[PDB]
């Protein structure tokens, strides 16, 4: 597997598409603001459990449109995006996001999707604080049009210091209403253990303690997998939905590959033992 490697500044080359990993991908960000607009394109190798996906949302005067396409052939990210592909406008959803607080200050807006497959989405991405020296720069609330991986319906995980959530629904404006805050959803009754980091220091018995699960996240979960700048071993424990215990939905959450996720029902069943 070889791929096109392309920085947003447009400088490109060919990479013998990494080791083990084998998909090339293209990712496009379209920043659109009244008349004017701008397009960033990235291409490169990537791991196998990546897939085709969209997300699009309004912040004030502007709309942002993420999209990432995925194939698996020695050079196939090669060539242009994809007359009229928007011959129409489809589902209508509410949309806003944290970058201008449109979400947080209830300044929600109507946004129509550009394709027949897109649904309305509410994604939540919360982090206690530091890891590198500030951590991911995901907007904390984002809602709008899209088709994200493992979508129909919902999924979520939280633990001592993180909370991620995807609602993803096919009905008209089915994404509206007040923005979730976790500390804000009911305790469901389950207790589960919680940690991040390595099995020794990070996720050791002495460092792993119970938390009260909330909302529909009522399975205790253990995930092990391999982190980015290719530091192996990363483990995570917490409260999740059954949806999370199915598929590598935790992958994209925690910037992790090649991942096993055990899960269980009875409270506390979650311990390193």
């Amino acid at each position: 597997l070889r791929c096109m490697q392309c920085k947003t500044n447009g400088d490109c080359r060919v990479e013998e598409c990494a080791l083990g990993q084998d998909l090339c991908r293209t990712t496009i960000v379209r920043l659109w603001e009244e008349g004017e607009e701008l397009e960033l394109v990235e291409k490169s190798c990537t791991h196998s459990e990546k897939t085709n996906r969209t997300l699009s949302y309004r912040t004030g005067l502007k709309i942002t449109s993420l999209t990432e396409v995925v194939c698996g052939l020695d050079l196939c990210n090669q060539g242009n995006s994809g007359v009229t592909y928007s011959r129409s406008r489809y589902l209508e959803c509410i949309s806003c996001g944290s970058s201008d607080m449109s979400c947080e200050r209830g300044r929600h807006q109507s946004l129509q999707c550009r394709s027949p497959e897109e649904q309305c989405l509410d994604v939540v991405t919360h982090w206690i604080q530091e890891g590198e020296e500030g951590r991911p720069k995901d907007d904390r609330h984002l809602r709008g049009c899209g088709y994200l991986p493992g979508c129909p319906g919902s999924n979520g995980f939280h633990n001592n210091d993180t909370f991620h959530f995807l609602k993803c629904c096919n009905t008209t404006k089915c994404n509206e209403g007040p923005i979730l805050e976790l500390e804000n959803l009911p305790q469901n009754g389950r207790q589960c253990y919680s940690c991040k980091g390595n099995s020794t220091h990070g996720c050791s018995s002495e460092e792993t303690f119970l938390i009260d699960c909330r909302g529909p996240m009522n399975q205790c979960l253990v995930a092990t997998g391999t982190h980015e700048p290719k530091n192996q071993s990363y483990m995570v424990r917490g409260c999740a939905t059954a949806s999370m215990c199915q598929h590598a939905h935790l992958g994209d959450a925690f910037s992790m590959n090649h991942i096993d996720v055990s899960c269980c029902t009875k409270s506390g069943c979650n311990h390193p033992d």
Partner: protein
């Protein structure tokens, strides 16, 4: 019939060719005289 000189600020017309609303460029649906007619 297309043409945005027609009113030029109704909104999205689901049975209509080009559009003349505020998001037509987003949806990539403007009339080629939008810019001209109502955005000089």
């Amino acid at each position: 019939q297309e043409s945005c000189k027609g009113r030029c600020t109704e909104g999205f017309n689901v049975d209509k060719k080009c559009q003349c609303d505020e998001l037509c460029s987003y949806y990539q649906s403007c009339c080629t005289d939008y810019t001209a007619e109502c955005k000089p």
